[PDB]
Amino acid sequence: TIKTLTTKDIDNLKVEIKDFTGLNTKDKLSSDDAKQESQKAFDAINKIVDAFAENNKADIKDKKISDSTIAAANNLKTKADNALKFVNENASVTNWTDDRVQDFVNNKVVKTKEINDLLSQAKTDLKLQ
């Protein structure tokens, strides 16, 4: 059965990720917290990708996520997966160094605004709200 996304489903896909700005040492950001937040972001973006795919499977011409938005969702999924892999590989006392904490915070971790921008762009593509 064909089923497309409403504004309520997209709002139900929103998630808030902890802000790690300014945490630049291992005593201020544990690998467990980084792992938990990266897992949160990964799971949320996976659900978002699956929901977008199911929406577009309906093949309703005026209720379509643009290919650009689909690609952006896939790229954000890749970023979240890379962040989770980075934390998992470097969680130990030996590998979770200040340099790796700074690398995670500045380059790897997913931020709430990225997911929210993706969802709002999806809303625009579907002419919702």
Side-chain angles (χ1 to χ4, degrees):
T1 57
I2 271 172
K3 57 209 321 296
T4 53
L5 291 166
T6 69
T7 307
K8 186 188 288 295
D9 310 313
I10 291 173
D11 286 343
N12 278 349
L13 295 166
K14 285 166 152 185
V15 297
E16 188 78 30
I17 313 298
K18 282 185 181 179
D19 179 16
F20 291 136
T21 319
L23 305 182
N24 66 320
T25 78
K26 58 189 150 193
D27 36 67
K28 288 122 84 279
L29 176 52
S30 73
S31 65
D32 301 305
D33 282 358
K35 181 179 298 187
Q36 176 169 55
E37 294 307 302
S38 292
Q39 188 73 55
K40 193 195 303 191
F42 181 58
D43 298 342
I45 300 159
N46 285 342
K47 285 180 74 182
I48 290 175
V49 168
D50 288 354
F52 287 179
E54 188 169 339
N55 179 87
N56 282 10
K57 195 163 94 107
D59 187 34
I60 301 314
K61 67 153 77 281
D62 78 339
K63 298 179 74 60
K64 277 283 197 167
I65 306 289
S66 85
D67 290 341
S68 187
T69 306
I70 297 294
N74 289 334
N75 283 325
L76 190 58
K77 177 177 163 153
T78 302
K79 181 178 178 168
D81 193 17
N82 286 342
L84 188 53
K85 287 176 163 33
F86 183 83
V87 179
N88 289 335
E89 289 170 2
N90 294 295
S92 81
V93 65
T94 300
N95 296 325
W96 195 245
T97 65
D98 294 347
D99 288 350
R100 296 220 170 85
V101 170
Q102 293 164 32
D103 191 11
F104 174 73
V105 169
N106 297 333
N107 305 313
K108 310 294 187 176
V109 69
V110 176
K111 301 167 173 183
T112 305
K113 190 180 171 62
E114 298 175 285
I115 304 172
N116 284 340
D117 292 347
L118 181 63
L119 295 177
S120 84
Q121 182 58 59
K123 278 177 186 182
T124 291
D125 293 2
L126 300 167
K127 296 158 300 218
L128 293 188
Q129 217 175 54

